[PDB]
Symmetry: D3
Subunit: 231 residues, 6 copies
């Protein structure tokens, strides 16, 4: 039985939208029909409701690979199998402006720790999202005429260890943004058989945001994410 | 400036009791005189008040190395420099009963990620707490006649990977418990110049409550305010 | 000046279809209009011609990451910037039959050697193909009603070091097939700014082909690849 | 059975002269008595004939470790067990002139890929050629009054990565040349029980022809048929 | 059956004071009652005698992890289970002066050989001394009014590969000194179940001595060490 | 300025015969003309004298890579540039008998510490002896009708971590024996420009001896070694 997410079985939907910040989970729940808080233990708020004719949940995953791994595992134990992460990111290329969106196609990461414990060796396993789901997401964002970019991101483990060199290094490796939990999400999903994808809102540009404008972009895009999730 | 812990100048004390669970931070704040909630952004609760007429703070660090690193870095930017983690752990030896305490003397860990980004290579830097502060914790606990054990712990990055062969491997390596953030706390502290220590409440035994948390929080607070 | 591919400048098209076997390069050239052999040095046959209203080349890359890296680099030096690899692969899942196709979405690999020399450290850089190009490929194969599967593959460096354990290990890591040069192609392309993708013909199933049936599938699919390349 | 080198039973000799370039294999076959093309699949040309009235084969191995591993594995399945690589190399020291030869005594390499799959871990296994065969090569070359050098080489996996700092790093480590397949040849041979050696023609000097290849092929063939 | 230290069982005490220099072993045996030379094979001098109504041995461990690992293993086979390392060290910080002492709380080290062979993987096992025994040492040194510092050290494997960058790197990682065998002593003791500790005499300061001044400090603190060993 | 070997410059010869056991150094000095003890510090005995109208030193290097690295560095500072290791080894193959000799052609080793500190990365540098000098040894042993084998050895860092799996693993990797310092000697000699070689006496056979039989073999081949050193 899950020791972090204390929701009753059946209280978590098969389709889940995961966000790092609890407050955003609460804000996004207002987009659902008849939202109910199904868990608040350890600050990991989970809301379940309806969108279209489908049941869906919005869960908090906290910060970092170890945190999201725990939440995903327990949500799966509760019946979840489809996850779409909706978070913030720091752009690594100058042509992407704050507030715009990034649909992730892959995640780069430094090996070790979590990956070693799960994979049992240092192999560079392809950390990619579900192909179908990611395309559906692209379509959804395209229909709502939202400004987005398709590309790989680097999943950092040390937020406060990202100097200037850091930018040229990862941008030169085909990464257009940095975040912290996509690598874990994709790799764990591939191993567990879960279908996952991710959309990010550019909160800052490292090659060059207000809490209000963030929410404005968040809301405008969450609509595309929910349509996708329930498509 | 801090983008997660949105506290004002002078709202975070120099000495901080850090816990992973927001609920425990709240619960523990009731032991302080006139506790004030100085932050709730992203769910990371931080309280500040007095104990033994001394200013202190109790903060939430979430789960895992990446999370606690960010929290410690921001708390330090707001003025903190002494950290004592008070969490839960899974015993790796059969002779430790639930509800008892473990005063941590070191942390084993798997190389990679966070450590590589901070250390710039894969050397195994000694992950240890402040010598003096740890001895004070030992003193505070024994004075309170509490049942504690002193030993190293393994700081895991994958709670749900910790398999079968797990217990034997880590206990045969000198570790008596498993937790997830002591290695990050100790190493980052040694590197940034912070004084850190850790005491854990045994919540489960892999080889085989609130009363316990409350019972020892006093000893912890006594040490932080000495 | 390239020391392996001795084609004259302008003799290599911007769009290139790369195959491992020289014989297949020769066989596929019959699909082009007015094919001309532009290089035969070191056995790396390169043919250039037209398909639709676009100029396009078919090049031999040999076997392995080190070989394809050299060929791609020299072809790029000669003006190439778009590559689609069309090769054979060993399926890792029982539900994929010989002769069917696999459109690769990512490549897993063991770190070291080539990746270390190019990346300068052990970081697990996302080894993914161009998102747009790969979707175009999917569409092309769909229109011609070809049986294909979308997924990640493992790029092995040791053909004769792939035991039974090997299968369960990589199939459990989200890989549906094993090949030898996709990881190199994708990662080098991401670093150099080239647009690449890959389609494979299942030649064998490790969870369970004649030279004739191979060519039959090859031909039937190369038509979808060329349309994509010149789309 | 071999899926790349499609030769019949008894068409591949026990002793094989291996080269990366198909064109050189063809060229060298003219030095044999009644050479027959026993394979051309995937472009890997293999000839078999006599030299000094002795049966031998000249085979193409392509470029890089992964390619030569496959070729050696299949040649061995067809009966080969003695391999002498004859290729080109880039000198790492300024005192070696183009057209001269290097008899290889060992191969440095970066861990990973191919070696990990075969060795099952990242230990640095000594990558060396057969002691006896290498001394015979030395003897054959000196008898032919040819200018050769004896030393280790670095087997690179990325021809176009070999940067600036490159030359200084590898030459300061005891290597006098750079090539791409000696490490795979030597290690796999030690592991599979094959007798291998390597002689290289200097095609370029990073620190600063067919006549040369032909001139030394004789010494190589003399050694393979002794 | 030990092949390096040819001492007969019963001739090695449960408590052992280990030093790298055979000459220091002889000098220190002078502080014991009725010292007997129990082994001289391969130069590893071992003396056994009494101190404060307790049997104690002083053993030579040579230089480096491989050397000390062998000596500890063999002494343990002969009955030893408590070891206190008394060596010399190079200070990594400016404020520690020559002749002063360092009581070790942990040892950093570069991954590799010895550790990999014993631990069987590259995990960073906490290389720390026995808590009780170490606090005992601290108490003994205070009771003797000796100037000591308490901190971590870096156990180097290459004495002549300790340049300028070196000092800044390791001191910034929380180590106050450099020596060569503590990490091996601590880690092996944790695996084998032995109780170990270490106190070092500062012989040089890499941030900023004669063997005469050394022996004075060595002897000056030798009593504190032996008191701790027999306490 | 050496701090371990206190020999004065001019007292160490350009050619040095190195052994791990101080006792063997003394025994072998018996074969020199007018041997003089040039150093005894830290137990590292060094003798200097003549043999075949040539000055030669016999030096003790202790056990392990760290130990020998220190001794070689210091001897080199005092003028040495040619070293021949004469140690003992455990055979990994059945056909080599106790008392017979092995002339080393290369040394395998586990990555880590010492190598990382000197080389500055984990590259597998070819750890081989000087070609000319090694062929010289082979010739000397043949001229003396001594039974020898020529092959690679594995330089282990943990003597007591050599189990059953161990023997099969290393012998299958082409090594015929195990010892502890050849890889360090060869690699360091390549970096520093010294000319080194090694010949070992089989003292045990891990696949399937008294110090009396040992010394006989040691002395029996000592002349071959010294002849080579002064040839
Ligand atoms: C700024 S709050 C950090 C959180 O948002 C994402 N993030 C946004 N910007 C960045 C950045 N510049 N570096 C790393 N993570 C970032 C991460 O996934 C983490 O959970
Ligand atoms: C039980 S909630 C898990 C949290 O408590 C600690 N913990 C308690 N028991 C364990 C265990 N068995 N394994 C890993 N972490 C544990 C971790 O540091 C994490 O923040
Ligand atoms: C069978 S010929 C090997 C070539 O075809 C691909 N291949 C096909 N089947 C396999 C397999 N089972 N393992 C590895 N590579 C394979 C590789 O990319 C290599 O260039
Ligand atoms: C010049 S063609 C490259 C081929 O010859 C060898 N070679 C020649 N010169 C070099 C060089 N400078 N760097 C790497 N390999 C080289 C390689 O093993 C490869 O098969
Ligand atoms: C100079 S004495 C060398 C011995 O003392 C310790 N030591 C003293 N100073 C240093 C130093 N600067 N670097 C490394 N080890 C040192 C080591 O453990 C070694 O056995
Ligand atoms: C038993 S003598 C140990 C010494 O001789 C060599 N040696 C002899 N036998 C072995 C063995 N079985 N394993 C490792 N080293 C050995 C080592 O280099 C060490 O300095």
């Amino acid at each position: 039985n899950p020791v972090h997410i204390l929701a009753k079985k059946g209280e978590v939907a098969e389709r889940v939208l995961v966000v790092g910040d609890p407050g955003r989970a609460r804000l996004l729940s207002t987009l659902l029909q008849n939202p109910k808080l199904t868990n608040e233990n350890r600050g990991f708020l989970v809301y379940t409701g309806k969108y279209n004719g489908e049941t869906v949940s919005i869960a908090t995953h906290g910060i970092g690979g170890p945190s999201i791994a725990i939440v995903l595992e327990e949500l799966a134990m509760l019946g979840a199998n489809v996850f779409i992460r909706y978070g913030t990111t720091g752009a690594l290329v100058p042509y992407i402006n704050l507030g715009e969106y990034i649909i992730v196609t892959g995640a780069s990461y430094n090996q070790g720790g979590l990956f070693y414990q799960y994979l049992r060796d240092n192999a560079c396993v392809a950390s990619t999202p579900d192909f179908e789901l990611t395309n559906k997401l692209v379509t959804s964002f395209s229909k709502r005429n939202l400004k987005y970019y398709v590309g790989n991101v680097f999943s950092s483990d040390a937020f406060y260890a990202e100097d200037e060199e850091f930018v040229k290094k990862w941008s030169s490796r085909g990464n257009i943004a940095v975040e912290m939990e996509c690598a874990t999400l994709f790799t764990l999903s591939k191993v567990k058989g879960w279908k996952s994808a991710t959309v990010l809102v550019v909160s800052d540009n490292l090659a060059k945001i207000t809490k209000e404008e963030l929410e404005k972009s968040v809301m405008d895009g969450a609509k595309a994410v929910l349509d996708t999730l329930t498509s």
